Structure formats: structure tokens, C-alpha cells
Design a protein around this nucleic acid. Sequence first.
RNA 1: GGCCGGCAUGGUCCCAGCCUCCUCGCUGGCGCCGGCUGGGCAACACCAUUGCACUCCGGUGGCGAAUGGGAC
Length: 95
Amino acid sequence: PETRPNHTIYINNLNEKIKKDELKKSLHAIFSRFGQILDILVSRSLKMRGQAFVIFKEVSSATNALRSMQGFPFYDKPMRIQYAKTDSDIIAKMA
RNA sequence: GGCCGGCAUGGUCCCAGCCUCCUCGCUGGCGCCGGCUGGGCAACACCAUUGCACUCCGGUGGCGAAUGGGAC
Ligand SMILES: [Mg+2]
Ligand SMILES: [Mg+2]
Ligand SMILES: [Mg+2]
Ligand SMILES: [Mg+2]
Ligand SMILES: [Mg+2]
Ligand SMILES: [Mg+2]
Ligand SMILES: [Mg+2]
Ligand SMILES: [Mg+2]
Ligand SMILES: [Mg+2]
Ligand SMILES: [Mg+2]
Ligand SMILES: [Mg+2]
Ligand SMILES: [Mg+2]
Ligand SMILES: [Mg+2]
Ligand SMILES: [Mg+2]
Ligand SMILES: [Mg+2]
């Protein structure tokens, strides 16, 4: 359902027909305005398809991105967003 | 994509057309029928999947495809 605040947002219900490189770029296009993005992780494997991790440098960015883009129609599908359950390695490798 | 068999089929060159998972080719292929067989999921389609990762990594399918004109 939902979890504790995090630098990283977990996005799913994404259109699975879209390729990894395009998907990453399109996600930057709509999410960059919430704050600096450290990385976007995408895989098309059987387990990880339809999903993305957007890693913000500051948690407040993640928070605003989550509230604002919940259900945003993206490649004809309503985007579902939550905080990631765990910190991404890029975040742990800092603080 | 490869090989073989049967039948049909005069040769060389030119132009145009058509076909596609298999160099979309600046020279790849394209008579009819039938059997054997290779590679790969890179793209595409379909099936399955709503999945919390930081390790690339589900499956199946097609190629069971494609002809006119001219010069000598
Ligand atoms: Mg990209
Ligand atoms: Mg990458
Ligand atoms: Mg997967
Ligand atoms: Mg033969
Ligand atoms: Mg005869
Ligand atoms: Mg015959
Ligand atoms: Mg002869
Ligand atoms: Mg003649
Ligand atoms: Mg020609
Ligand atoms: Mg034409
Ligand atoms: Mg064609
Ligand atoms: Mg047979
Ligand atoms: Mg986790
Ligand atoms: Mg085959
Ligand atoms: Mg002729």
C-alpha cells in the first residue's frame, strides 16, 4: 500500500511495451522539475518490467513527485507511485 | 538462414517489381511440389506476468515469404 518516506519513488503500472532507454528518458522529462535526479533504474526482465525507481537527491522532491504525479497518464496507463521500501545504493553510498 | 529429392525449365545482359526474425543489402532472395535441419530472442507480434530492484537473463511464433517487361 504505502511506506515510510524515501529518496527513491517506486513507480509501477508502467507500459511494458516501451523500451528501457526511452522509458528512462521520458521519466526524466516529467519528473526532473521536482528536483535533481541521481538516477532512474529500469529493467525489462520478467520480474521487473512495468516498474521504475526514480532516485531524487532530496526526499522532499520524492514527496512532491509522489503527491503530484499519482495516477498520471503515461503511455496511456495511469502511473502508480509509492516510496521505495529500501534505500537505493547510490543514496547509501553517500550518508 | 542451410542441405537434399522430384518435376518443370534454351543462354547472356538490362530495367522495373515483389518478399523478409536471418547483413533491408551499395547485389540478399523471389519456377512448382515435398522432406530434413541450423541460429537467435537483437527488433516485431502473441502468450504469460502488477512484479520493491540496485547481477544481463520467461516462453512461443515468422523465412509456411516473394515476377513482369526489354535488348541481344
Ligand atoms: Mg536512457
Ligand atoms: Mg543503464
Ligand atoms: Mg524482471
Ligand atoms: Mg533444389
Ligand atoms: Mg513434367
Ligand atoms: Mg513439376
Ligand atoms: Mg541448357
Ligand atoms: Mg525471346
Ligand atoms: Mg531488377
Ligand atoms: Mg516499387
Ligand atoms: Mg516488401
Ligand atoms: Mg514432414
Ligand atoms: Mg526491497
Ligand atoms: Mg525455422
Ligand atoms: Mg525478358
